[PDB]
């Protein structure tokens, strides 16, 4: 359940470290964004000389949340951090790698390049 | 809403209600029959019946459990030696409550009597 002001850990090699949600791209007035949702976010912390810098307004896609995500099979899944991955306007991952596991819902929502770059899809 | 919530509050907080049930259990297990208001009467039954059945069990664990609520060692000895045996074949219903005719003058409280079965 990511909403505006929520801090996300970036799980790629774009140079960013923490972004902050500022909008959920999902209709005119969505309240929360879960796994597989594209958001607009302001970069709040980055390593030097990266692909992006602090203050950059980028679009990301959430890959794991601290809220649990319910699945039709009756089961659920929950992670220890709310994490996102920066993307471009063509849903492509801007970085070259992703770190940590990502959720399987992404495969349903057309993020095959992030799913392939994942070390483990859960 | 109160849907399926058991037990009364009796305009008392937790410790006050607990001590009320305890003191009435003591007074009853002593005198055999006490006069109380009808709600306190209808609520005593669970407490006293559970204690009496526990005394019917008879072992040391039951004596310590009952002594948690009763504290008085002599009263518990009386409950195990005199009161318990006369309910050896009775399964539950060790107490009874009968409504009294006339109310109370100061406040109009409807009274009742709670006594131990024969």
């Amino acid at each position: 359940m990511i909403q505006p002001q929520t801090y996300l850990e970036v799980a790629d090699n774009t140079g960013a470290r923490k972004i902050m949600c500022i909008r959920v791209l999902k209709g005119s007035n969505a309240k929360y964004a879960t796994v597989g949702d594209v958001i607009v976010a302001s970069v709040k912390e980055a390593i030097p000389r990266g692909a992006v810098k602090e203050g950059d307004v980028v679009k990301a896609v959430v890959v794991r949340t601290k809220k649990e995500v319910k699945r039709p099979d009756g089961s659920a899944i929950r992670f220890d951090d709310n994490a996102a991955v920066i993307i471009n306007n063509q849903l492509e991952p801007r970085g070259t790698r992703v770190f940590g596991p990502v959720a399987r819902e992404l495969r349903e929502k057309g993020f095959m390049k992030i799913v392939s770059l994942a070390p483990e899809v859960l | 809403m109160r849907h399926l919530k058991s037990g009364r509050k009796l305009n008392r907080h937790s410790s006050h209600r607990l001590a009320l049930y305890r003191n009435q259990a003591k007074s009853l297990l002593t005198h055999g029959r006490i006069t109380t208001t009808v709600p306190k009467a209808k609520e005593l039954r669970g407490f006293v019946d559970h204690l009496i059945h526990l005394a019917k069990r008879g072992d040391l664990h039951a004596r310590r459990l009952v002594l948690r609520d009763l504290q008085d060692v002599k009263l518990v000895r009386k409950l195990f030696d005199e009161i318990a045996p006369r309910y050896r074949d009775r399964q539950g219903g060790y107490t009874r409550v009968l409504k009294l005719a006339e109310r109370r003058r100061g406040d109009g409280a409807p009274l009742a009597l709670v006594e131990l079965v024969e």
Partner: protein
Amino acid sequence: AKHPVPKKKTSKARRDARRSHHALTPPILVPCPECKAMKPPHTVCPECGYYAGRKVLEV
């Protein structure tokens, strides 16, 4: 709160019409099947001490 207050003195008609539901209902009594004394049902007879056909209380 700005202290609401009665606008007009209530007419005797209106106050008595409001009180139209104040009448007491008389008690509910039955004869005790031992001393035939009138007493509330489901209570122990306070004139003979009997209930359910046996002594319970000294009257």
